[PDB]
Design a protein around this ligand. Structure first.
Ligand SMILES: *[C@@H]1O[C@H](CO)[C@@H](O)[C@H](O)[C@H]1NC(C)=O
Ligand SMILES: *[C@@H]1O[C@H](CO)[C@@H](O)[C@H](O)[C@H]1NC(C)=O
Ligand SMILES: *[C@@H]1O[C@H](CO)[C@@H](O)[C@H](O)[C@H]1NC(C)=O
Lengths: 98, 49
């Protein structure tokens, strides 16, 4: 569902927050102290029920966080009508001069 | 302001040179001399800003 980039990932160093949606993207920059509380269900197993919607619980705090960004979805979940031709999703990340 | 303006600030000491076009705002004390203060900002512990 997404990726995190930053250093020390706390409310003391500027941090990124990149999450991918169904068809959206919510990239942002903040100083959130953390957001690692997904609240995994005791019955989170997908074999019984795969129901997991809006399981974000993100940006718990924001002291100095204003820079926000939204655009169209990046990952295009597509099906080849079978699991054998799995979508070999490939990404390359570099961060020269922004 | 007839008493002067003090809302405009600048950082003084840092660990290394700044990369081109990269903000480095941070709230902590400078490690100078031989006393790495934990926020005491005593001797040899100068406020960066
Ligand atoms: C995420 O996608 C759903 C449906 O694709 C949409 O309803 C929701 O608004 C999106 N999230 C945001 C933050 O816009
Ligand atoms: C599967 O999940 C449903 C509700 O999500 C629950 O009622 C059921 O007992 C679970 N187990 C089986 C074997 O269906
Ligand atoms: C950032 O948020 C804190 C929260 O208390 C506030 O005190 C401060 O003025 C804000 N701005 C800066 C530059 O720290």
């Amino acid at each position: 569902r997404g990726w995190i980039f930053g250093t020390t990932l706390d409310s003391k160093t500027q941090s990124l927050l990149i999450v991918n949606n169904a068809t959206n993207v919510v990239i942002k920059v903040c100083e959130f102290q953390f957001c690692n509380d997904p609240f995994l269900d005791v019955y989170y197993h997908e074999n019984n029920k795969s129901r997991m919607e809006s399981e974000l619980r993100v940006y718990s705090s924001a002291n100095n966080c204003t820079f926000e960004y939204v655009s169209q979805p990046f990952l295009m979940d597509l099906e080849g009508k079978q699991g054998n031709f799995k979508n070999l999703r490939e990404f390359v990340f570099k961060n020269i001069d922004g | 302001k007839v008493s002067g303006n003090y809302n405009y600030l600048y950082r003084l000491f840092r660990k290394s040179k700044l990369k081109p076009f990269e903000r480095d705002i941070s709230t902590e004390i400078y490690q100078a001399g031989n006393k790495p203060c934990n926020g005491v900002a005593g001797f040899n512990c100068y406020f960066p800003l």
